[PDB]
Structure formats: C-alpha cells, structure tokens
Amino acid sequence: GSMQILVTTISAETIRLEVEPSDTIENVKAKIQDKEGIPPDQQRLFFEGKQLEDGRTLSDYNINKKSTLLLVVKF
Amino acid sequence: GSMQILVTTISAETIRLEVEPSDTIENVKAKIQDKEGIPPDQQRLFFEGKQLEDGRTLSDYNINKKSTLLLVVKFH
C-alpha cells in the first residue's frame, strides 16, 4: 500500500526449574504453567534440536543439571 | 539442589503497519497499541541497530517500503 512496514515483535525470558531426572516432560510442562501460566498443549519443548514429546522422561533425552531447554509460545 | 534446569522461553510475531513517511515514531508506537495492545512508552523500537526516538519521523532514519523494524517487548 502507501508504505507497508514489518515489525518484528520479540518477547523473551529465562525460567529456572527444579526438576527430578525421573520427571516426565508432562510434569515439566505442568511446572511451566505454575511459573508463567501457559497450558501444556500449546507449549513446545526442545533440547538438542529434538522436540520433547510426552510419555518419556528427562533421563531419556539425557537432561541433567544446568541444561538449556527451549520453549516456543504464541504472540 | 537436586537438578536445576534453564528454560529459554521465546515468543515472536511480525506486525504489518501501513504508515506515511511523514509519521513520527510516537504515531507508529500508537499504531502498535491498536494492533497488539501494548502502551507506547513501554515499547522499544529499533532500525539498523539505532533505537528509534518518539520525536523523529520515519524519513529521518530513512525507512521506506519493505523495511524491517524491531520491537522488543517485556515478558508479561
């Protein structure tokens, strides 16, 4: 149109979570809901590029102390 | 204690804005409030690394058609 401009809107935060190696990623998503207020269904967890899927644990993906996890959310 | 992991929470979206080259940054910030719902003083605008100031126009920073602007917004 007249002059169409693009605005790259960014929002970012780093949340620390006290978890057990026995904790399922379902339980990890539940801990994020208490900390921020995002439902587990719309949450997308990542580690080493691989999308963390429910039914498995943090030990299965070999996640230990001081591990960087990636959470991608809407708007 | 037992195991303390870090979760890098990211949220991103691109907003399309019909603006005039005569428009000031305070007017562009007002247009973002209508599109998303963020107050103009709590939003930081950028172009070519330089932080865009409320007083100056889009012509002053040489912003034209198909220009990518950066808006950094608070967590929640």
Residue numbers in the entry:
A (entry chain A): -1 to 73
B (entry chain B): -1 to 74
Article sentences:
With ∼600 members, the RING/U-box E3s form the largest family. This family uses a RING or U-box domain to recruit E2 enzymes thioesterified with Ub (E2∼Ub) and facilitates transfer of Ub directly to substrate. We generated selective UbVs for each RING/U-box domain and used biochemical assays and structural studies to identify two types of UbVs: competitive inhibitors of E2∼Ub binding sites on UBE4B or phosphorylated CBL and an activator of XIAP.
The earlier and later fractions eluted at volumes consistent with a dimer (UbV.XRD) and a monomer (UbV.XRM), respectively. UbV.XRD forms a symmetrical domain-swapped dimer in which β1 is flipped 180° away from the β sheet of its own subunit and is replaced by β1′ from the other subunit. Whereas residues 6–9 in wild-type Ub form the loop between β1 and β2, in the UbV dimer they extend β1 and participate in hydrogen bonding with β2′ and β1′ to form a continuous anti-parallel β sheet across the two subunits. We postulated that reverting Ala10 to Gly as found in Ub might fulfill our criteria because only the main chain of Ala10 is involved in interactions with XR, whereas the side chain is buried in a pocket on the second UbV subunit. Gel filtration chromatography revealed that UbV.XR A10G was exclusively a monomer during purification and remained a monomer after incubation at 4°C for 1 week (data not shown). The UbV.XR A10G variant showed no evidence of binding to XR in SPR assays and did not stimulate XR-mediated UbcH5B S22R∼Ub discharge. Taken together, these findings suggest that UbV.XR dimerization is critical for XR binding and stimulation. The β strand domain swap in the UbV.XR dimer appears to be a unique arrangement for a Ub-based dimer. Once UbV.XR dimer has formed, no shift to monomer is observed, but the two dimeric subunits have some degree of flexibility relative to one another.
